[PDB]
Design goal:
This protein is mainly beta. Helices cover 8% and strands 33% of the residues. It is classed as hydrolase/hydrolase substrate.
C-alpha cells in the first residue's frame, strides 16, 4: 500500500495474508471457515504446496491462525488481467471470533459508483519496486474512478466489465506489488473487489484496477 496508514486490530477481520515459499506474496479474504478469495494471478500456474494463509493477525509473519491449501479454483474465464479471481480451499478450517470474521460480498449485478469511497488493505510495498515490505497491515482510502475514465487511461478493451478502478488523479494513494488478491471494501464495509493490476503504483492518471466481486459473484457463490 502506497500512501496508507497502519491498520488497527480488528480492522478487516476477514483479511488473510498469503505467503509463497515462506515469503510475502499476496493477500486474500476469508469467505467462510474453509474458503479464501484471492486474485487468480496470485495462484494460477504455481505449485499449491507453496502457499500458506494467515488470518487474525496484523502481522503477515506471526500470530493468528494458519492453513495450507487443499485446492485452488480460478474463474473459468480468467486470462491475464481479466476475471482475476480464485477460490482457495483451506486444509485447516478457521473459525470466526475475536479478530477473525468472514467477508460480506457485493451482490450479483452490482458495480461500484464513481466517486464513492473505498478502502484497500495489504502488506505490499510502499513504493514501486520497494526493497522491503511491511510486517504489519496497511490501509488506504481512495475514490472509485469511473470505468469510462479508467478506459481513457488504459484503453477501451483493457478495462472490462469485470474490473473497476480506484485511485486519485494526481496519484499518491494505491495498492502495489504484494497487495494483489487482498480486499477493497465500500463505505458499507462490503467486499467489492480484490487488488488486481495497474500501471505502476499510485501514478497520476493510472488508476488501480480491481477484480469486481459483483461481477464475478456467481463464480464465488458456486464454489464458496
Amino acid at each position: 500500500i502506497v500512501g496508507g496508514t497502519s491498520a488497527s486490530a480488528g480492522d478487516f477481520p476477514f483479511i488473510v495474508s498469503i505467503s509463497r515459499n515462506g515469503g510475502p506474496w499476496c493477500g486474500g479474504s476469508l469467505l467462510n471457515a474453509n474458503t479464501v478469495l484471492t486474485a487468480a494471478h496470485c495462484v494460477s500456474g504455481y505449485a499449491q504446496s507453496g502457499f500458506q494463509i494467515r488470518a487474525g493477525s496484523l502481522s503477515r509473519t506471526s500470530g493468528g491462525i494458519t492453513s495450507s491449501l487443499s485446492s485452488v479454483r480460478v474463474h473459468p474465464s480468467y486470462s491475464g488481467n481479466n476475471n482475476d479471481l480464485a477460490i482457495l480451499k483451506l486444509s485447516t478450517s478457521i473459525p470466526s471470533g475475536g479478530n477473525i470474521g468472514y467477508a460480506r460480498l457485493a451482490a450479483s449485478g452490482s458495480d461500484p459508483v464513481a466517486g464513492s469511497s473505498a478502502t484497500v488493505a495489504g502488506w505490499g510495498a510502499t513504493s514501486e519496486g520497494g526493497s522491503s515490505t511491511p510486517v504489519n497491515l496497511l490501509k488506504v482510502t481512495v475514490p472509485i474512478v469511473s470505468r469510462a475514465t479508467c478506459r481513457a487511461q488504459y484503453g477501451t478493451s483493457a478495462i472490462t466489465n469485470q474490473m473497476f478502478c480506484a485511485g486519485v488523479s494526481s496519484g499518491g494513494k494505491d495498492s502495489c506489488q504484494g497487495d494483489s488478491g487482498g480486499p477493497i471494501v465500500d463505505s458499507s464495509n462490503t467486499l467489492i473487489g480484490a487488488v488486481s493490476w495497474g500501471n505502476g503504483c499510485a501514478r497520476p492518471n493510472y488508476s488501480g484496477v480491481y477484480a469486481s466481486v459483483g461481477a464475478l459473484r456467481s463464480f464465488i457463490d458456486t464454489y464458496a
